[PDB]
Design an enzyme around this catalytic site. Sequence first.
Site, PDB file in Angstrom:
ATOM      1  N   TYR A  58       0.791  -1.231   0.000  1.00  0.00           N
ATOM      2  CA  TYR A  58       0.000   0.000   0.000  1.00  0.00           C
ATOM      3  C   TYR A  58       0.828   1.289   0.000  1.00  0.00           C
ATOM      4  O   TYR A  58       0.301   2.374   0.256  1.00  0.00           O
ATOM      5  CB  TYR A  58      -1.001  -0.013   1.163  1.00  0.00           C
ATOM      6  CG  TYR A  58      -1.990  -1.154   1.090  1.00  0.00           C
ATOM      7  CD1 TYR A  58      -3.127  -1.067   0.283  1.00  0.00           C
ATOM      8  CD2 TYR A  58      -1.788  -2.324   1.818  1.00  0.00           C
ATOM      9  CE1 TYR A  58      -4.035  -2.112   0.206  1.00  0.00           C
ATOM     10  CE2 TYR A  58      -2.690  -3.374   1.749  1.00  0.00           C
ATOM     11  CZ  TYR A  58      -3.812  -3.264   0.943  1.00  0.00           C
ATOM     12  OH  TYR A  58      -4.710  -4.304   0.873  1.00  0.00           O
TER      13      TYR A  58
ATOM     14  N   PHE B  25      -8.621  -3.446  12.258  1.00  0.00           N
ATOM     15  CA  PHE B  25      -9.764  -3.723  11.384  1.00  0.00           C
ATOM     16  C   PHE B  25      -9.338  -4.158   9.984  1.00  0.00           C
ATOM     17  O   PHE B  25     -10.067  -4.885   9.308  1.00  0.00           O
ATOM     18  CB  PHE B  25     -10.716  -2.518  11.311  1.00  0.00           C
ATOM     19  CG  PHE B  25     -10.068  -1.251  10.820  1.00  0.00           C
ATOM     20  CD1 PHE B  25     -10.005  -0.964   9.460  1.00  0.00           C
ATOM     21  CD2 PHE B  25      -9.534  -0.334  11.720  1.00  0.00           C
ATOM     22  CE1 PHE B  25      -9.410   0.204   9.008  1.00  0.00           C
ATOM     23  CE2 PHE B  25      -8.940   0.837  11.275  1.00  0.00           C
ATOM     24  CZ  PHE B  25      -8.878   1.107   9.916  1.00  0.00           C
TER      25      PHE B  25
HETATM   26  C1  LIG Z   1      -4.839  -9.437  -2.404  1.00  0.00           C
HETATM   27  C2  LIG Z   1      -3.799  -8.995  -3.437  1.00  0.00           C
HETATM   28  C3  LIG Z   1      -3.062  -7.675  -3.237  1.00  0.00           C
HETATM   29  C4  LIG Z   1      -3.392  -9.848  -4.642  1.00  0.00           C
HETATM   30  O1  LIG Z   1      -3.920  -9.259  -5.835  1.00  0.00           O
HETATM   31  P1  LIG Z   1      -3.081  -9.091  -7.207  1.00  0.00           P
HETATM   32  O2  LIG Z   1      -4.002  -9.440  -8.353  1.00  0.00           O
HETATM   33  O3  LIG Z   1      -1.747  -9.790  -7.078  1.00  0.00           O
HETATM   34  O4  LIG Z   1      -2.810  -7.502  -7.260  1.00  0.00           O
HETATM   35  P2  LIG Z   1      -2.435  -6.732  -8.628  1.00  0.00           P
HETATM   36  O5  LIG Z   1      -1.968  -7.736  -9.654  1.00  0.00           O
HETATM   37  O6  LIG Z   1      -3.568  -5.791  -8.962  1.00  0.00           O
HETATM   38  O7  LIG Z   1      -1.155  -5.870  -8.167  1.00  0.00           O
HETATM   39  C5  LIG Z   1      -1.001  -4.494  -8.512  1.00  0.00           C
HETATM   40  C6  LIG Z   1       0.252  -3.941  -7.842  1.00  0.00           C
HETATM   41  O8  LIG Z   1       0.211  -4.195  -6.433  1.00  0.00           O
HETATM   42  C7  LIG Z   1       1.415  -4.824  -5.979  1.00  0.00           C
HETATM   43  N1  LIG Z   1       1.115  -5.997  -5.114  1.00  0.00           N
HETATM   44  C8  LIG Z   1       0.023  -6.783  -5.197  1.00  0.00           C
HETATM   45  N2  LIG Z   1       0.054  -7.767  -4.263  1.00  0.00           N
HETATM   46  C9  LIG Z   1       1.186  -7.619  -3.552  1.00  0.00           C
HETATM   47  C10 LIG Z   1       1.839  -8.320  -2.416  1.00  0.00           C
HETATM   48  N3  LIG Z   1       1.263  -9.403  -1.839  1.00  0.00           N
HETATM   49  N4  LIG Z   1       3.028  -7.840  -1.976  1.00  0.00           N
HETATM   50  C11 LIG Z   1       3.613  -6.763  -2.540  1.00  0.00           C
HETATM   51  N5  LIG Z   1       3.076  -6.081  -3.573  1.00  0.00           N
HETATM   52  C12 LIG Z   1       1.886  -6.451  -4.117  1.00  0.00           C
HETATM   53  C13 LIG Z   1       2.200  -5.251  -7.212  1.00  0.00           C
HETATM   54  O9  LIG Z   1       3.565  -4.835  -7.102  1.00  0.00           O
HETATM   55  C14 LIG Z   1       1.510  -4.595  -8.395  1.00  0.00           C
HETATM   56  O10 LIG Z   1       2.347  -3.612  -9.002  1.00  0.00           O
HETATM   57  P3  LIG Z   1       2.380  -3.404 -10.601  1.00  0.00           P
HETATM   58  O11 LIG Z   1       1.067  -2.723 -10.907  1.00  0.00           O
HETATM   59  O12 LIG Z   1       3.594  -2.533 -10.819  1.00  0.00           O
HETATM   60  O13 LIG Z   1       2.510  -4.796 -11.174  1.00  0.00           O
HETATM   61  C15 LIG Z   1      -2.681  -9.731  -2.636  1.00  0.00           C
HETATM   62  O14 LIG Z   1      -2.174  -8.929  -1.548  1.00  0.00           O
HETATM   63  C16 LIG Z   1      -3.011 -11.119  -2.098  1.00  0.00           C
HETATM   64  O15 LIG Z   1      -3.334 -12.035  -2.845  1.00  0.00           O
HETATM   65  N6  LIG Z   1      -2.896 -11.290  -0.776  1.00  0.00           N
HETATM   66  C17 LIG Z   1      -3.570 -12.351  -0.047  1.00  0.00           C
HETATM   67  C18 LIG Z   1      -4.878 -11.891   0.587  1.00  0.00           C
HETATM   68  C19 LIG Z   1      -4.609 -10.850   1.649  1.00  0.00           C
HETATM   69  O16 LIG Z   1      -4.140 -11.177   2.730  1.00  0.00           O
HETATM   70  N7  LIG Z   1      -4.924  -9.596   1.324  1.00  0.00           N
HETATM   71  C20 LIG Z   1      -4.099  -8.456   1.678  1.00  0.00           C
HETATM   72  C21 LIG Z   1      -4.520  -7.858   3.014  1.00  0.00           C
HETATM   73  S1  LIG Z   1      -3.652  -6.294   3.278  1.00  0.00           S
HETATM   74  N1  LIG Z   2      -5.981  -4.535   3.697  1.00  0.00           N
HETATM   75  C1  LIG Z   2      -6.349  -4.392   5.095  1.00  0.00           C
HETATM   76  C2  LIG Z   2      -6.727  -5.747   5.678  1.00  0.00           C
HETATM   77  O1  LIG Z   2      -7.098  -5.552   7.048  1.00  0.00           O
HETATM   78  C3  LIG Z   2      -7.692  -6.660   7.743  1.00  0.00           C
HETATM   79  O2  LIG Z   2      -6.710  -7.622   8.138  1.00  0.00           O
HETATM   80  C4  LIG Z   2      -6.393  -7.495   9.527  1.00  0.00           C
HETATM   81  C5  LIG Z   2      -7.416  -8.244  10.379  1.00  0.00           C
HETATM   82  O3  LIG Z   2      -8.723  -7.707  10.146  1.00  0.00           O
HETATM   83  C6  LIG Z   2      -7.079  -8.137  11.864  1.00  0.00           C
HETATM   84  O4  LIG Z   2      -8.032  -8.883  12.628  1.00  0.00           O
HETATM   85  C7  LIG Z   2      -8.793  -8.044  13.500  1.00  0.00           C
HETATM   86  O5  LIG Z   2     -10.051  -7.706  12.897  1.00  0.00           O
HETATM   87  C8  LIG Z   2     -10.947  -8.808  12.770  1.00  0.00           C
HETATM   88  C9  LIG Z   2     -12.204  -8.373  12.022  1.00  0.00           C
HETATM   89  O6  LIG Z   2     -11.844  -7.762  10.770  1.00  0.00           O
HETATM   90  C10 LIG Z   2     -11.285  -9.325  14.161  1.00  0.00           C
HETATM   91  O7  LIG Z   2     -12.237 -10.384  14.063  1.00  0.00           O
HETATM   92  C11 LIG Z   2     -10.017  -9.830  14.831  1.00  0.00           C
HETATM   93  N2  LIG Z   2     -10.314 -10.260  16.184  1.00  0.00           N
HETATM   94  C12 LIG Z   2      -8.972  -8.721  14.862  1.00  0.00           C
HETATM   95  O8  LIG Z   2      -7.719  -9.269  15.288  1.00  0.00           O
HETATM   96  C13 LIG Z   2      -5.668  -8.654  12.135  1.00  0.00           C
HETATM   97  N3  LIG Z   2      -5.345  -8.475  13.538  1.00  0.00           N
HETATM   98  C14 LIG Z   2      -4.639  -7.924  11.278  1.00  0.00           C
HETATM   99  C15 LIG Z   2      -4.983  -8.010   9.794  1.00  0.00           C
HETATM  100  N4  LIG Z   2      -4.031  -7.226   9.031  1.00  0.00           N
HETATM  101  C16 LIG Z   2      -8.818  -7.322   6.950  1.00  0.00           C
HETATM  102  N5  LIG Z   2      -9.200  -8.567   7.589  1.00  0.00           N
HETATM  103  C17 LIG Z   2      -8.381  -7.604   5.525  1.00  0.00           C
HETATM  104  C18 LIG Z   2      -7.877  -6.331   4.873  1.00  0.00           C
HETATM  105  O9  LIG Z   2      -7.447  -6.609   3.536  1.00  0.00           O
END
Ligand SMILES: CC(C)(COP(=O)(O)OP(=O)(O)OC[C@H]1O[C@@H](n2cnc3c(N)ncnc32)[C@H](O)[C@@H]1OP(=O)(O)O)[C@@H](O)C(=O)NCCC(=O)NCCS
Ligand SMILES: NC[C@H]1O[C@H](O[C@H]2[C@H](O)[C@@H](O[C@H]3O[C@H](CO)[C@@H](O)[C@H](N)[C@H]3O)[C@H](N)C[C@@H]2N)[C@H](N)C[C@@H]1O
EC number: 2.3.1.-
Lengths: 396, 396, 396, 396
Positions: free
Chosen positions: C120, C396
């Site tokens: 991000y 969150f």
């Molecule tokens: C959810 C998600 C971002 C994957 O989607 P994706 O289709 O790979 O994302 P995109 O292809 O649209 O990526 C676009 C840009 O974001 C960046 N990016 C995406 N996922 C990334 C990751 N896991 N780590 C670092 N950079 C990432 C890439 O560098 C990319 O850059 P580019 O446009 O220069 O190629 C990815 O984080 C994922 O699969 N994570 C598992 C689920 C999860 O936990 N969600 C994140 C919670 S914060």
């Molecule tokens: N991109 C932002 C991300 O934020 C959250 O992840 C976060 C989780 O939501 C967090 O979980 C917390 O939030 C959840 C509810 O979302 C609660 O049920 C749980 N007890 C509490 O620990 C956890 N502690 C950390 C994690 N990074 C979302 N679940 C997914 C989202 O993509």
Amino acid sequence: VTLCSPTEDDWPGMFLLAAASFTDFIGPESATAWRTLVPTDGAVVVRDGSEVVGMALYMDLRLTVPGEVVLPTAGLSFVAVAPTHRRRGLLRAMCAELHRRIADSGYPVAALHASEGGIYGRFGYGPATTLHELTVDRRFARFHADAPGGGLGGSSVRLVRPTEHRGEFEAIYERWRQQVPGGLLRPQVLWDELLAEAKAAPGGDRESFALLHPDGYALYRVDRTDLKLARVSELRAVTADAHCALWRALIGLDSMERISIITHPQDPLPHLLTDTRLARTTWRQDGLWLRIMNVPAALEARGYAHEVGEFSTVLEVSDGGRFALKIGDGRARCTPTDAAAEIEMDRDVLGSLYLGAHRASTLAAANRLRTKDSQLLRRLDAAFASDVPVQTAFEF
Amino acid sequence: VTLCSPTEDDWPGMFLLAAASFTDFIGPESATAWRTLVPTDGAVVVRDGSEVVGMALYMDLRLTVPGEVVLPTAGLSFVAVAPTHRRRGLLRAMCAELHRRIADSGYPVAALHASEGGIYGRFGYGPATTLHELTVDRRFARFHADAPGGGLGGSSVRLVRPTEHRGEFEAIYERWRQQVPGGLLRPQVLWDELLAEAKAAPGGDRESFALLHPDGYALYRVDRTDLKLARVSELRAVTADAHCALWRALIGLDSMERISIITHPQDPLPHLLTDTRLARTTWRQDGLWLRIMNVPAALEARGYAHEVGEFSTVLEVSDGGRFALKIGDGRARCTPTDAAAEIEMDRDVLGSLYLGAHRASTLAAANRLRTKDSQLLRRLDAAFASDVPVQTAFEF
Amino acid sequence: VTLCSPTEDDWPGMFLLAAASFTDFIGPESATAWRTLVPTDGAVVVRDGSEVVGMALYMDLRLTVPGEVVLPTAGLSFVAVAPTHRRRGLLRAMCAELHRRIADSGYPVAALHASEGGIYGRFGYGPATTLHELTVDRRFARFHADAPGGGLGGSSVRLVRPTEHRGEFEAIYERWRQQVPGGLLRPQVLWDELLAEAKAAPGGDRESFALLHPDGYALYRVDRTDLKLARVSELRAVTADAHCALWRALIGLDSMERISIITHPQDPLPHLLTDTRLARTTWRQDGLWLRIMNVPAALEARGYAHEVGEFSTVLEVSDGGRFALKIGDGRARCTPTDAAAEIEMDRDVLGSLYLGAHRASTLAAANRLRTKDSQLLRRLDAAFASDVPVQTAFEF
Amino acid sequence: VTLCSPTEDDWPGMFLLAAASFTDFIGPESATAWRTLVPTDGAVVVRDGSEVVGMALYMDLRLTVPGEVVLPTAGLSFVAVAPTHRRRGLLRAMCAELHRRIADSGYPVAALHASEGGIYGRFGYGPATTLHELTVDRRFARFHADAPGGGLGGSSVRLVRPTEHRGEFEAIYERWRQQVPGGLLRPQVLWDELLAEAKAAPGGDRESFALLHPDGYALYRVDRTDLKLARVSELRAVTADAHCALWRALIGLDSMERISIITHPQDPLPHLLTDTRLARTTWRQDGLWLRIMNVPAALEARGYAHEVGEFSTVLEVSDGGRFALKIGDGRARCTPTDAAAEIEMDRDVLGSLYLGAHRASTLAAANRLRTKDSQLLRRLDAAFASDVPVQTAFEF
Ligand SMILES: CC(C)(COP(=O)(O)OP(=O)(O)OC[C@H]1O[C@@H](n2cnc3c(N)ncnc32)[C@H](O)[C@@H]1OP(=O)(O)O)[C@@H](O)C(=O)NCCC(=O)NCCS
Ligand SMILES: NC[C@H]1O[C@H](O[C@H]2[C@H](O)[C@@H](O[C@H]3O[C@H](CO)[C@@H](O)[C@H](N)[C@H]3O)[C@H](N)C[C@@H]2N)[C@H](N)C[C@@H]1O
Ligand SMILES: CC(C)(COP(=O)(O)OP(=O)(O)OC[C@H]1O[C@@H](n2cnc3c(N)ncnc32)[C@H](O)[C@@H]1OP(=O)(O)O)[C@@H](O)C(=O)NCCC(=O)NCCS
Ligand SMILES: CC(C)(COP(=O)(O)OP(=O)(O)OC[C@H]1O[C@@H](n2cnc3c(N)ncnc32)[C@H](O)[C@@H]1OP(=O)(O)O)[C@@H](O)C(=O)NCCC(=O)NCCS
Ligand SMILES: CC(C)(COP(=O)(O)OP(=O)(O)OC[C@H]1O[C@@H](n2cnc3c(N)ncnc32)[C@H](O)[C@@H]1OP(=O)(O)O)[C@@H](O)C(=O)NCCC(=O)NCCS
Ligand SMILES: NC[C@H]1O[C@H](O[C@H]2[C@H](O)[C@@H](O[C@H]3O[C@H](CO)[C@@H](O)[C@H](N)[C@H]3O)[C@H](N)C[C@@H]2N)[C@H](N)C[C@@H]1O
């Protein structure tokens, strides 16, 4: 494949077997200093034809038994067989030969430190002492109000370098080893090796330090990897005051988190603190093993408890014979006989009981010693019990 | 801040304190079943004003002392102060109020299991038994030729579900607890809770299994995370044969690598094997703690060793008074006196000596008990020594 | 592959993605309670064609910024893309769509908790708060002589069940979250789920406990595996006396060895003890992430330091435009301009500086913000510096 | 129990007390080279009677404070008491004697590195700098677009042997130590010790390498056991360009998995990477401890922030007198007075504030400094804040 006494040409070959069989082998240099304690015709070797593939020796040592009596003891060491010649019966041949030499030399008892508790069970060796490692979290350790030297004033303990105060250590140890059961005489050659292991080796152990009391000493060193653990390699104390005074100094090490010591089960350190559990027993194992060579000579020489009532019985050793035993007023009469035996035990069962670290009642439930008289068991428990707690002197 | 007896409204508040203080709190459910053993006015609570912020209680138990004598014993349990009211002096008040009630209820001795070995040292409680965790590598384990039941034939040991043979276990334990010192009477309610812990909890402990002998039993369970370890939670054996027969079955578990058991130091297991070193003492700690409430009543009820000459001495308890002691023929005479004392000790020192786990000579070296006469020490060591080795019954 | 708002039929598919993407997914049960915080057209889905293979949403939250001002904040959550459709551009399409919806709804700022500190950075989100885990060895912990409430008398802290005091916790939190920067409003639906996570789950976490004070509270629980560690999940304290009194109670947990708490870098706990080092920082990580949606709206609404001299400058956001900033006496004027830019920074650089957790001098050394005026740089450090220390509310 | 200055005959005895009290003791060889910095009558010893059992000394060092002003500072080192003489009051006598000697020599401040953060809390020493270890997983570490030296071209950093480039290292460090607060003057003798530790010791540490930028240097070495970790023992960079240039080289070590470095909290390394979380803070502790000897002399010689309004207030120290303080335009006026005190703090609280590592608001929350004016607190936070981030120089 035959057995014979070693020559000067065999000694370079004997070090090669030793270094390959013992990980803690003190090199080709120190083994010559240990050799000065090996008597003539006190070593056996086995050649293949021819290279040396088997070796076993005993040392002339002085073991103190209960009642402050010092017995000449054959200290078995360097017992090793080449990995290419095991399962043949080389140990069986070597140990049976040495015992014949030990019996002819006039030794009442033979002793060794075991690598495993199963190899020397059948050879008549029994675990005579018990090692008891205590580890103290010294940050929480606070002494009891009853502990000696509780008030303020110049403490009788000093922090000194071990090599610069050698003559004082030899004097204190000599006073210790004579009054404590299990104590061994330290000759001039063994102080040479012990004191040389005090200085820090490049990539090895750290520099040892000593705490000196008029009636005791503590030989400690900081662990090479665990910089918060001070490992007390040796703790000799004559007086009850000396024991407490050395521990006040040991817990004084504000640089350390923990103080570890390999000691004896009846160590009074736990009770010396307010919290007895702070002296945790982290490790327990058998130490010095005993084989009674001359049954009547060893039993007569030992001092027994005065508290037990006078009793007489006929004891049977597996293949040692049948002996009459008369215990009363601290001393014992033991003469060979052939009258009906009351107690039957193996040669190694007597080995454990001798120094009084193991109770006969414990061995009776294990059926290691058999008797139809349960009252006789209670009397053997009391009589064989040592007045002064049993300790292990040093490893050989 | 006021101290009083608890009502029915206090229990919900008490369970809150219990759950916040003890991690292994059996829950508000099982604590009510344990309550049936607490006598009327056998509990004390401290309130702030008002919520309960301090609690302590004792249970009516029956402890077996040396000589198969069963004494009424106050079992101190559920002793907890709220974390918001520590260093305020709540325990000092509660323990003093309970001991008062214990002495008024005519109990000779008080007993507890300590969370730390330093909290109850000043309150008169001393380590009366010793725990001894033995871990046996059963893969290398081979029984000695002297071990009972060495021949072939149908073994008298069965693999049974513990919940289906409750009547047999209660009968065997009752026999065991009456003949072994440190043994406690286990009522109907504690057998209910023990068998409730046999069944496997979802995401907790695994299902318990039992090995049944006509004269002994073995309660074991596989460790939740270590799938190769079998933890013997309980081993009760009346006869010497039963102990050996059950251990042949335990080492018979070809599914496991190691069998671990928390037992007593005098356990005959190591001598049963060819290799005594295989029964490794991995863990050592104090078990049952004892505070002698009524000095003459407790000492007279106990059985002593016959293998000691008849002697008489005056014993002093730091603030418990002065007592004359006459030991002879296994029995003792004890009445209050004011004649010059020969031995001085704190109340907790007597607690440790009572069951005979600790020697008086060991406590004398730590200056916990003081005397000018060294001959008296040797006599006190032999007399207080238990004939049948001391064992910890259960944890409360 | 198309992007649109979700319907009722999409939810069962969304929970599949959430369960497969998030290890700590609270199940399909609790996510419905969190859904009540997502406004209409505040969620987006991407289908294949059809199955949902990408989701992202924001929640209507209320963030308190320096100067006790509360701003409506879009809280990004549940952002996940199916493992079968990654590297395709689904996230870049979803986040751009939501930033469109957020700006259309009129939120001045956007917020999220990142799973990685690199995903991000490009989207405009910067690390706004820092998490600070302190583990205190409570056995050694002793309070300084200057620590508030260091005398005898009734402590104002109670040990209570969390589920039975919901009314007071909500009241204390509301008072806390309004005066502390980084504090979020907690709706009824979130208190529902928080108190439901307090009860002991079979094979999960242990029962949670609460320490209640008129001006603060502490929610803690013993770790499932580490039974000597108590984890403070939440510590809300309004007054300086409440913080200190709660920590006397927390260290009062004589059952535990260590007390761990995830807090902020400006926590006064280390200085509250005699040894500042006993409150060890065992873990450091970023907490809340911030993206300023409306640059002039956020900077004006924020409160600034009164200590800095009044200055006017022009700052430029990479793709946000050029703005004239007039900072003087707590408040600031921010109007878009086309005059010469003096400061140049990315969108995420402003996000980090906004709450005042990261100083501008640190980012300038890293070349994240550019200026040829070093005097202006020092004035930015002082102006954006939060008077009241920045804290993380909830995750969150 | 007598205190006096050490003679030539006392040095061999002092080395024994040093080696036993310090595990990382540089041996009897190197301690003589450090003694060239100990001034005449800058050391004290305590003898028993006679053997030396207590020792303490200070070194003549030049510390750089905020505002680039260099102050002569007494560097407390080798402060140790024998384990046989603790709880006697030897430290209290030695430190008070040296403080008396330090004040006579005209030192404004005194400095040390503590073994525990509680020993020197009452002696007037406070945590003045903060150590901050960062373990960077270089496998994932990618530099941000804003980080200096982005594109292609010959890098101005070289891989050089440290002993062959002594001249440049002394030149770069001298520039660094004069502009950065907390910077100490490293004399001719200390570069001898640093470069002697670079060579690979048998069984000890590995060969040290250096990365050379015209404006900065990086001293690193591979860990003894961890063959994938490169431990950066030293990182000195004058320009912000050099800091970034050396880190591109450090992450260039493809042989390593991780790069660790003990630095300061305001290190701009995380903002250099696209993932700020890859620069994980694994370890966090206090560094340099400061005791203000001369209150007005130290406060007047320090450089303060320009971005704060001009104010005048009366400050007290518990038992150090009362002082009138006037801060404006970056410099301060301080003279002893007796007018009504507004701020009340201990001597160690001033030590923490002096270098500007600890905020006055945090210390006031912990009640370490007391004032009834909350406005005065905010101004003390801004004034004492160092413009250039505070760094720990070297360990003494
Ligand atoms: C959810 C998600 C971002 C994957 O989607 P994706 O289709 O790979 O994302 P995109 O292809 O649209 O990526 C676009 C840009 O974001 C960046 N990016 C995406 N996922 C990334 C990751 N896991 N780590 C670092 N950079 C990432 C890439 O560098 C990319 O850059 P580019 O446009 O220069 O190629 C990815 O984080 C994922 O699969 N994570 C598992 C689920 C999860 O936990 N969600 C994140 C919670 S914060
Ligand atoms: N991109 C932002 C991300 O934020 C959250 O992840 C976060 C989780 O939501 C967090 O979980 C917390 O939030 C959840 C509810 O979302 C609660 O049920 C749980 N007890 C509490 O620990 C956890 N502690 C950390 C994690 N990074 C979302 N679940 C997914 C989202 O993509
Ligand atoms: C060295 C040595 C004793 C083995 O020699 P070996 O040729 O196998 O001995 P033998 O064949 O004569 O064995 C004779 C009996 O001893 C027993 N035995 C020998 N080594 C044993 C071992 N390591 N463990 C258990 N039992 C052993 C055998 O069971 C055998 O019984 P059997 O007569 O019923 O067949 C053996 O201990 C060894 O190899 N150890 C490594 C060196 C060492 O550390 N020595 C011990 C110093 S205390
Ligand atoms: C429960 C309890 C006794 C704490 O209450 P407390 O208010 O600290 O007890 P008090 O203030 O009455 O203590 C009186 C004396 O006992 C000692 N003491 C009390 N608790 C102690 C502990 N946990 N460790 C060591 N000593 C302790 C004190 O040194 C004090 O000595 P003093 O009279 O010289 O001041 C305490 O043991 C505790 O909190 N333990 C955790 C809960 C638990 O598991 N209970 C114990 C089961 S064995
Ligand atoms: C060196 C030294 C402090 C011991 O001296 P000492 O004789 O115990 O000190 P004193 O008896 O004069 O103690 C005076 C005060 O300091 C405190 N103190 C001393 N050593 C302490 C330690 N290790 N931890 C915490 N506090 C300590 C005591 O609480 C005492 O307070 P009081 O006046 O209220 O009783 C001690 O640190 C030590 O022995 N350590 C080994 C050497 C070392 O590492 N020194 C520190 C180098 S930075
Ligand atoms: N002051 C004496 C203390 O004794 C007990 O603690 C002890 C526990 O009661 C013991 O727990 C045992 O007893 C409890 C019931 O009390 C059983 O539910 C549990 N299965 C069993 O293990 C546990 N094994 C050891 C612990 N010291 C009391 N719970 C609290 C009391 O204060």
